[PDB]
């Protein structure tokens, strides 16, 4: 469904694709899709950091790689001091 569908495909749609995207490629194992799904990710976003953070070991990045898992952390912040008061 990815590979048939992206010049058929708008911009705020593209970026609610590449998420099931990268890990439907990285499932598959074919590398080179996975690189150009991850790019289309915000980086704003936990995922988005998490997608560069294993292209990063993919290719043997381990400084770059490990500022992309802190980074990750840290976007991940907002999302469980939401829902980590009220029930675990």
């Known amino acids: ?3 048939e569908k992206w010049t058929l495909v708008n911009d705020e749609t593209q970026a609610k694709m590449a998420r099931m995207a990268a890990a439907a490629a990285w499932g598959l194992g074919q590398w080179d899709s996975m690189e150009e799904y991850t790019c289309m990710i915000p980086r ?3 995922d988005g ?3 560069r953070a294993v292209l990063a070991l993919h290719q043997d990045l381990f400084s770059l790689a490990q500022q992309c898992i802190d980074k990750a952390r840290d976007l991940l912040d907002a999302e469980l001091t939401a829902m980590a008061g009220e029930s675990y």
């Open 44 to 46: 704003d976003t936990h």
């Open 1 to 3: 469904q990815c590979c």
């Open 49 to 51: 950091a998490f997608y």
